[PDB]
Amino acid sequence: ETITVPTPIKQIFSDDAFAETIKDNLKKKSVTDAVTQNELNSIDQIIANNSDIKSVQGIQYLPNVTKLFLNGNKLTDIKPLANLKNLGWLFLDENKVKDLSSLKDLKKLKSLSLEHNGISDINGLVHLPQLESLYLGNNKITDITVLSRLTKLDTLSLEDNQIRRIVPLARLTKLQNLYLSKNHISDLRALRGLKNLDVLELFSQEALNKPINHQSNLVVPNTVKNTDGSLVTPEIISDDGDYEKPNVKWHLPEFTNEVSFIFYQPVTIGKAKARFHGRVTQPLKE
């Protein structure tokens, strides 16, 4: 938490690439140059996107840093951020930060970006109800329960995850930019109260029905639902099927292991327009 003698930058900051970042931030000549706690205390901002950083060890001695631009590095461990109590913006897109528990005490964090991190558990974000901006695109998330607590969010991206249940978003009325494309969403009722939306994306959903028994004359309830709960009429039905609301119907004279349908609905929420479209797969059992 502090250094008590002038100390080589390369001593404090174990990663070479991070040492080099600190040297450039402080305008030092070399990584072997002695630094003081007073100089480390002057660091408000580190911009080191795309800098091949494997570890931010030594960052613990920068008590005043409020902004970290660390996108496009190779970080796995953020425990060195745990006690940076003034952190306000933290950009970690394209790393491998999987463990979020170190964010717990960052009560000033307003903007967090963790795109493409292989994240599946975001329950540790329950400790950041003050968050206003949250990018979690391109991860492995299914359960967004904790997001119901993040009621200050005006920006949220969850595109390219494996979310079906969007109920946790319903009360998040501050949302202005919401990115939900490439999930598993069939039902938009949760989004109906988001009257402040300016930007909404709902492209390319994939829904999977629980298996049913094949029948030569198959009847399957349509489950794709607009914000008002109404069923979205399908646009293409597989295997020469047809639609008789509320049901999709197929003549399947031989067994086949699946049918499907594709849907599309232009939707308006708040001030925002989006194309909700996707497909529904119905596996069949012999």
Curated annotation (Swiss-Prot):
All copies of the LRRCT domain together span 206-286
Question: Where's the LRRNT domain?
Answer: 1-41
Annotated knockout phenotype = Deletion of inlB alone decreases host cell entry; the reduction varies from 99% to 37% depending on the cell line tested.
Q: Where is this region: Ig-like region?
A: 206-284
Q: Name the residues that span the membrane.
A: none
Localization per Swiss-Prot or TrEMBL? Secreted; Cytoplasm; Cell membrane
Where do the LRR repeat units fall?
40-62, 63-86, 88-106, 107-128, 129-152, 154-172, 173-196
Q: According to its record, what is known about the domains?
A: The N-terminus (36-79) resembles a truncated EF hand, the LRR region (80-240) has a curved form, while residues 241-321 form an Ig-like region; the whole region forms a curved tube. The LRR domain alone (31-241) binds mammalian MET and stimulates its Tyr-phosphorylation; the LRR plus Ig-like region (36-321) are required for receptor dimerization; adding the B-repeat allows the protein to scatter host cell colonies, and the GW domains, especially GW2 and GW3, potentiate MET activation.
By sequence similarity, the record places it as follows: Belongs to the internalin family.
Protein function:
Mediates the entry of L.monocytogenes into normally non-phagocytic mammalian host cells. Its host receptor is hepatocyte growth factor receptor (HGF receptor, a tyrosine kinase, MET) which is tyrosine-phosphorylated in response to InlB. Downstream targets MAPK1/MAPK3 (Erk1/2) and AKT are phosphorylated in response to InlB, which also causes cell colony scattering. Complement component 1 Q subcomponent-binding protein (gC1q-R, C1QBP) has been suggested to also act an InlB receptor, but this is less certain.
**Subunit organization:** Interacts via its LRR repeats plus the Ig-like region with the extracellular portion (residues 25-741) of its receptor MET; MET can bind HGF, its endogenous ligand, and InlB simultaneously. Probably forms a dimer upon interaction with host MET, which subsequently allows dimerization of the host MET and subsequent host signaling; dimerization probably occurs via the convex surface of InlB. Prevention of dimerization does not block interaction with MET but prevents downstream action.
Q: What protein am I looking at?
A: Internalin B
Please name the taxonomic classification of the source: Bacteria, Bacillati, Bacillota, Bacilli, Bacillales
In the UniProt record, the gene name given for this protein reads inlB
Q: Tell me the stretch of the parent sequence this chain holds.
A: 36 to 321 of 630
